[PDB]
From a paper:
Arthrobacter nitroguajacolicus Rü61a 1-H-3-[name]-4-[name] 2,[name] ([name]) and Pseudomonas putida 33/1 1-H-3-[name]-4-oxoquinoline 2,[name] (QDO) were [name] first dioxygenases discovered to belong to [name] ABH-fold family. They catalyze [name] O2-dependent breakdown of N-heteroaromatic quinolone-type substrates with concomitant carbon monoxide production. Atypical for oxygenases, these enzymes promote [name] activation of [name] triplet ground-state O2 molecule without [name] aid of metal centers or external organic co-factors. Kinetic measurements indicate that their reaction mechanism relies on a fast initial step, during which [name] substrates' 3-hydroxyl group is deprotonated by [name] His-Asp subset of [name] triad, thus promoting its activation for molecular oxygen attack (step 1), whilst [name] nucleophile is not essential.
We next employed [name] pressurization in [name] [name] state to probe O2 sites experimentally. Electron-rich Xe is quite easily detected by crystallographic methods and has been successfully used to visualize hydrophobic O2 binding sites in proteins. Pressurization of [name] crystals in a quartz capillary at [name]-[name] [name] a constant 30 bar Xe atmosphere allowed us to measure X-ray data at 2.9 Å using synchrotron radiation. Fourier difference density maps revealed strong peaks consistent with [name] binding at [name] B-site (as it overlaps with [name] substrate's B-ring in [name] [name]–QND complex) of all four [name] molecules present in [name] asymmetric unit. Modelling these peaks as water molecules resulted in significant positive residual density post-refinement, supporting [name] notion that Xe occupies this site. Occupancy refinement of Xe atoms gives values in [name] 40–60% range. Xe is stabilized at [name] B-site by [name] hydrophobic environment of [name] H102, F136, L140, L143, L156, W160, W185, I192 side chains with [name] closest atoms 3.8–5.0 Å from [name] gas atom. Although we performed our experiment at [name] [name], which compared to cryo-conditions, allows for enhanced protein, mobility we have not identified additional Xe binding sites in our maps. Overall, experiments and simulations agree that [name] ABH-fold [name] [name] features an O2 pocket (B-site) within [name] active site at a location that overlaps with [name] most hydrophobic portion of its aromatic substrate. Transient O2 storage at [name] [name]-validated B-site that we have identified overlapping with [name] hydrophobic portion of [name] N-heteroaromatic binding site represents a convenient solution to [name] problem of O2 localization, as one might envisage a mechanism of displacement that upon substrate binding transfers O2 from [name] B-site to [name] R-site that is only about 5 Å away, thus organizing both reactants for catalysis.
Author numbering: 1 to 275
The structure:
């Protein structure tokens, strides 16, 4: 169980929980970043793949964890500050950040603020690279609505599961996210909607980094050729960008193909170790 490595510390004004396996090994540390309205539990299978060979840190955001709570409004900028304060307390210098879906807003901002010495590379998992399509835009609006947020979550679950009876992913969505409420989901809708509005898209944000550096997008969904093409076109244009289609069933490769996620993370960690 990953609750063996679970800690809690005061980060500015808020008590945050975090995973830290405290492995005595060569860097970089692997910094696993949750998306919105879930926690380290998403990474329990991936932690198992990496545990022996890497120091593994998983911050939980304000109001997130085994016992969710209401907190004052914050966004991805604050997530960045919280992450860096945790790393500072732990004495971690070099790290490889790895995000799930909209944890990517945090990862890209973290690359900017931490710089390429501390954060030389990044891995983004299953993160919608294009601007919101009508269906996704509709989901965000429902999440923001105090009357319809739960309907919003159900619609997203349908999409993420993509018609698969995936035991582990279902357990995560239906049990491990069950305690999260409008305070989180509405916030996630406001933050993500604004992130797209202000930064245009994940691809725009990444291209606008002061110091571009190796980033790989590893994803299972969406499955359509048109999505593969935008990743391929971006990779043609930018030497520092690469991708891999993982062929996993759901939006949660960290859960359904953790072995595959781990080989990409290991490749990037090895590259860092060698200069
Ligand atoms: Xe979302």
């Amino acid at each position: 169980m990953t609750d063996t490595y679970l800690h809690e510390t005061l980060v500015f004004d808020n008590k945050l929980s975090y995973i830290d396996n405290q492995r005595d090994t060569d860097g970089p540390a692997i910094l696993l970043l949750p998306g919105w309205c879930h926690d380290h539990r998403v990474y329990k299978y991936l932690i198992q793949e990496l545990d022996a060979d890497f120091r593994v840190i998983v911050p939980n955001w304000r109001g997130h964890g085994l016992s969710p709570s209401e907190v004052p409004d914050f966004g991805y900028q604050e997530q960045v500050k919280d992450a860096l304060e945790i790393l500072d307390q732990l004495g971690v210098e070099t790290f490889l950040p790895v995000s799930h879906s909209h944890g990517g807003w945090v990862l890209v901002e973290l690359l900017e603020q931490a710089g390429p010495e501390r954060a030389p590379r990044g891995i983004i998992m299953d993160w919608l690279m294009w601007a919101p399509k009508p269906d996704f835009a509709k989901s965000l609006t429902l999440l923001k609505d105090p009357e319809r947020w739960r309907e919003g979550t159900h619609g997203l679950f349908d999409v993420w599961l993509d018609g698969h009876d995936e035991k582990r992913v279902r357990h995560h969505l239906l049990e491990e996210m069950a305690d999260y409420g409008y305070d989180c989901w509405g916030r996630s809708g406001r933050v993500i909607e604004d992130a797209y509005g202000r930064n245009g898209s994940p691809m725009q944000m990444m291209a606008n980094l002061t110091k571009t550096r190796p980033i790989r997008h590893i994803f299972s969904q969406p499955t359509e050729p048109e999505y593969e093409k935008i990743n391929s076109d971006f990779a043609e244009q930018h030497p520092w960008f690469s991708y891999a289609k993982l062929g996993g069933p759901t939006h949660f490769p960290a859960i359904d193909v953790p072995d595959r996620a781990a080989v990409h993370i290991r490749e990037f960690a090895t590259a860092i170790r060698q200069g």
